[PDB]
Amino acid sequence: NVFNPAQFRAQFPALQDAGVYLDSAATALKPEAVVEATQQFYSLSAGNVHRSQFAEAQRLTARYEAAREKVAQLLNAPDDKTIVWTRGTTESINMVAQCYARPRLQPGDEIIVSVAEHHANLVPWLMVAQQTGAKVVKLPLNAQRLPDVDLLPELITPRSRILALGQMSNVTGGCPDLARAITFAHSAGMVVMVDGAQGAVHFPADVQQLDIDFYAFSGHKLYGPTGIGVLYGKSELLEAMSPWLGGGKMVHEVSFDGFTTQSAPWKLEAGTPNVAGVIGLSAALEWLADYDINQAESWSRSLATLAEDALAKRPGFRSFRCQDSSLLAFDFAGVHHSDMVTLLAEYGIALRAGQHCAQPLLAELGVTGTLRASFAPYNTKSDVDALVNAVDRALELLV
Amino acid sequence: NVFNPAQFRAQFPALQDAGVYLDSAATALKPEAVVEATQQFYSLSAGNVHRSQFAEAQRLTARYEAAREKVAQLLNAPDDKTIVWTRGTTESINMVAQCYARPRLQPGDEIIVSVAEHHANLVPWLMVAQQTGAKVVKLPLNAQRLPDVDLLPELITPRSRILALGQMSNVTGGCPDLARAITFAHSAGMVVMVDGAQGAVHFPADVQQLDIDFYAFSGHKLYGPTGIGVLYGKSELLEAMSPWLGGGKMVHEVSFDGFTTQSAPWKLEAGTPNVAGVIGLSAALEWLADYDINQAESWSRSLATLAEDALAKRPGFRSFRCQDSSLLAFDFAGVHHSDMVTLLAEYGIALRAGQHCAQPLLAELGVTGTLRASFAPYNTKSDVDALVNAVDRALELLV
Numbered sequence: 035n036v037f038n039p040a041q042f043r044a045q046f047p048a049l050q051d052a053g054v055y056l057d058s059a060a061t062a063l064k065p066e067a068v069v070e071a072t073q074q075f076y077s078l079s080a081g082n083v084h085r086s087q088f089a090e091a092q093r094l095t096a097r098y099e100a101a102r103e104k105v106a107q108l109l110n111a112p113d114d115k116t117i118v119w120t121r122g123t124t125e126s127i128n129m130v131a132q133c134y135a136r137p138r139l140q141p142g143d144e145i146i147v148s149v150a151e152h153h154a155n156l157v158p159w160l161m162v163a164q165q166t167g168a169k170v171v172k173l174p175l176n177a178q179r180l181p182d183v184d185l186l187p188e189l190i191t192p193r194s195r196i197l198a199l200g201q202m203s204n205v206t207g208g209c210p211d212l213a214r215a216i217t218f219a220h221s222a223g224m225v226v227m228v229d230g231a232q233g234a235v236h237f238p239a240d241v242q243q244l245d246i247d248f249y250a251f252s253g254h255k256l257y258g259p260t261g262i263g264v265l266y267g268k269s270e271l272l273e274a275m276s277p278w279l280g281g282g283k284m285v286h287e288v289s290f291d292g293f294t295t296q297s298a299p300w301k302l303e304a305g306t307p308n309v310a311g312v313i314g315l316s317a318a319l320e321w322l323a324d325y326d327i328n329q330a331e332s333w334s335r336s337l338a339t340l341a342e343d344a345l346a347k348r349p350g351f352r353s354f355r356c357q358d359s360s361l362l363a364f365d366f367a368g369v370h371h372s373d374m375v376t377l378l379a380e381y382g383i384a385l386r387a388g389q390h391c392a393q394p395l396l397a398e399l400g401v402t403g404t405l406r407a408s409f410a411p412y413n414t415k416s417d418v419d420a421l422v423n424a425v426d427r428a429l430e431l432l433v
Numbered sequence: 434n435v436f437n438p439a440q441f442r443a444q445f446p447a448l449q450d451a452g453v454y455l456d457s458a459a460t461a462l463k464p465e466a467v468v469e470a471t472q473q474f475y476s477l478s479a480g481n482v483h484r485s486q487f488a489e490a491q492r493l494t495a496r497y498e499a500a501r502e503k504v505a506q507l508l509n510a511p512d513d514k515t516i517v518w519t520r521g522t523t524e525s526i527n528m529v530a531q532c533y534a535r536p537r538l539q540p541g542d543e544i545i546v547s548v549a550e551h552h553a554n555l556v557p558w559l560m561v562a563q564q565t566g567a568k569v570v571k572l573p574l575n576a577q578r579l580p581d582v583d584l585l586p587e588l589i590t591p592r593s594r595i596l597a598l599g600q601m602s603n604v605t606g607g608c609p610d611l612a613r614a615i616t617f618a619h620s621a622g623m624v625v626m627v628d629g630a631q632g633a634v635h636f637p638a639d640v641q642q643l644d645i646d647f648y649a650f651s652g653h654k655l656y657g658p659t660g661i662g663v664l665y666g667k668s669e670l671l672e673a674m675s676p677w678l679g680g681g682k683m684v685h686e687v688s689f690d691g692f693t694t695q696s697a698p699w700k701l702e703a704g705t706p707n708v709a710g711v712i713g714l715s716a717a718l719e720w721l722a723d724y725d726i727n728q729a730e731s732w733s734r735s736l737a738t739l740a741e742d743a744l745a746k747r748p749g750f751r752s753f754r755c756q757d758s759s760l761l762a763f764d765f766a767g768v769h770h771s772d773m774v775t776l777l778a779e780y781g782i783a784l785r786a787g788q789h790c791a792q793p794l795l796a797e798l799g800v801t802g803t804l805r806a807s808f809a810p811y812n813t814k815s816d817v818d819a820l821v822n823a824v825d826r827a828l829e830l831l832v
């Protein structure tokens with residue numbers, strides 16, 4: 035099933051106006067299928083009567099009912115009841131911290147968190163640690179700028195309960211030895227929260243093969259709607275979790291004496307779902323299933339490598355890129371990041387700078403922020419040339 | 434100027450296919466402005482480059498940046514920073530229970546909750562009471578089927594801290610005397626959680642005039658997107674609230690020792706927002722503001738009255754409707770509600786039966802469920818005739 039970059043590119047209506055779009059790691063452009071499924075959803079009754087668009091209404095209902103399974107197929111989850119709808123990776127992780135960890139954490143218990151984590155997979159652990167008297171323990175980087183998994187046997191103690199580890203950094207694009215980390219973690223009776231916001235896009239985790247306890251990601255990074263995300267959990271852990279928000283749909287019986295709940299996933303989904311989000315994400319995954327993602331990722335990484343090798347020929351260049359990622363974090367010594375971002379946009383290159391919600395990682399790397407060009411399968415060789423030329427022009431003006 | 438039902442109607446692309454749509458209280462049809470704004474948002478880059486669609490991009494940004502202000506104008510809130518984005522009424526209320534009440538409630542404190550509350554404004558209070566050693570005190574109905582605000586001085590004690598009260602029930606359409614209730618509560622130093630998921634649609638609350646502490650509603654009932662809701666709070670209460678989810682965007686400084694946050698509202702909004710939801714809700718509110726809601730609402734109510742008066746001439750009819758509401762909850766003795774739902778749909782009439790997420794209320798009214806026809810300003814006199822005729826034929830076929 036051969037990947038064809040031009041066919042892929044052709045599905046994105048934003049592209050002609052977008053210029054050279056290298057900001058996909060912050061959020062992805064949307065394929066036509068997502069745009070149209072969403073338009074149809076808001077242009078049709080959600081009731082049981084359809085006087086004139088019945089056929090289309092049935093297709094939307096089918097999209098909605100198949101959504102969990104499409105996520106399950108992405109992750110190789112054992113069944114679609116292990117998929118919980120959230121509003122994003124951030125909510126997913128907060129739910130694990132509050133619904134799984136909090137009722138189990140004892141004062142003195144330890145939560146090991148990688149120094150490479152996005153704030154989404156750090157602040158919730160700081161919060162629950164304060165709530166329970168538990169403590170957060172730093173998992174540092176090795177000399178290769180990856181979380182030092184080989185150090186885990188030294189950091190694990192009888193008090194360790196939780197490991198929080200990103201599948202893939204949104205700064206370096208680095209992927210730690212997740213399989214080995216889980217083995218150490220499970221040897222000590224710990225559960226692992228895997229942040230897959232970037233991994234789900236580039237190399238979606240086989241959660242059965244890796245024996246992942248919890249996995250989170252966001253739809254809007256996966257060519258999909260805003261306001262929608264996923265929490266995968268093993269059935270036994272979802273069953274063990276306390277309820278998240280209270281309200282309709284998650285409850286079974288309610289009285290002024292108390293309440294009982296549905297089982298998972300529904301236990302964890304109070305209120306009207308973001309139905310537009312679920313349908314659009316369903317459409318994105320259904321569209322995406324026509325493409326070989328390994329081939330699509332190799333294309334992206336190749337472009338990032340051509341970009342990195344060309345930029346390294348310019349003086350002052352510094353790269354924070356790991357493992358030939360699609361993500362290319364860099365800066366030029368002596369040049370202000372925001373000046374470079376602005377000039378690049380004016381020359382038609384869309385990317386960004388800043389701290390990328392990763393202050394502790396940037397402090398270890400010894401910088402205040404980085405530029406990041408992220409390449410996606412709708413990018414081209416021309417896009418690389420345009421990035422390089424735009425950087426040359428920026429440097430002329432700023433240096 | 435005078436409300437024109439035909440002009441209101443012409444803006445809803447779903448209306449021809451929808452047949453006789455009488456389920457707006459569950460979810461509302463959308464005007465073209467919402468469909469189009471959403472289409473545009475998903476069809477353009479959100480990055481910093483636009484080769485030619487700068488005007489369309491700037492309009493989307495203007496909708497997004499004005500959205501809080503448009504909510505404020507609907508509620509007469511004093512400023513747009515008292516508006517917090519959530520995923521729905523349900524999240525809003527859970528946020529108040531967890532971030533305002535939980536850190537303050539002492540063992541033995543009391544939370545007064547009306548028997549008419551939707552589960553969204555009951556289950557979170559059961560939950561936080563259990564977490565804090567507080568107790569929930571039921572506010573019963575009076576003879577008019579409204580929460581008995583005149584009874585509050587008797588139920589309030591020195592330990593009362595919170596009043597949870599719906600502005601308008603999704604079953605009876607009944608609106609209690611909110612001003613009196615709030616006066617009684619504030620006299621005793623209590624804060625009030627007002628569920629406006631229906632009220633916001635029919636009788637949008639003037640939160641300054643009523644001196645409401647917290648007000649919640651959902652976008653999808655207000656002619657808007659799914660996956661978006663509002664929490665209004667007095668600025669001092671938003672400021673006093675603990676953070677909600679932890680992560681990016683809500684934080685400012687972060688280390689492995691701890692963190693600081695943004696100020697409200699951003700303090701309370703972790704992660705990537707549901708940008709499509711905010712823009713679409715903004716578009717809904719901008720469109721809605723062209724209409725006198727009192728006139729549009731009196732039109733809906735008048736249709737519900739014509740329906741009720743007609744149905745009451747059929748033997749076995751029973752109504753649960755209060756105060757000439759736009760919502761008509763009813764029953765026919767000896768006939769299964771679900772059978773009637775199904776046959777009315779064959780007649781092109783869309784409504785629903787069930788428990789409406791209000792078990793304690795139904796128990797108090799002495800029934801296990803109800804039919805509910807809800808009228809909106811895109812409904813017509815001929816919709817009423819069609820409903821009444823459909824009911825006659827359903828009864829003939831079922832009885």
Ligand SMILES: *Cc1c(COP(=O)(O)O)cnc(C)c1O
Pocket residue numbers: 305306307458520521522523524551553554599601602603628630631651652654662
């Ligand atoms: C619909 C409704 C809610 C819940 O709204 P969500 O969007 O599902 O969170 C709460 N209260 C009342 C009275 C409602 O009608």
Ligand SMILES: *Cc1c(COP(=O)(O)O)cnc(C)c1O
Pocket residue numbers: 059121122123124125152154155200202203204229230231232252255263681704705706
């Ligand atoms: C984008 C991202 C997140 C947060 O996703 P939201 O949709 O904003 O909640 C978390 N972790 C990583 C590694 C990310 O790239």
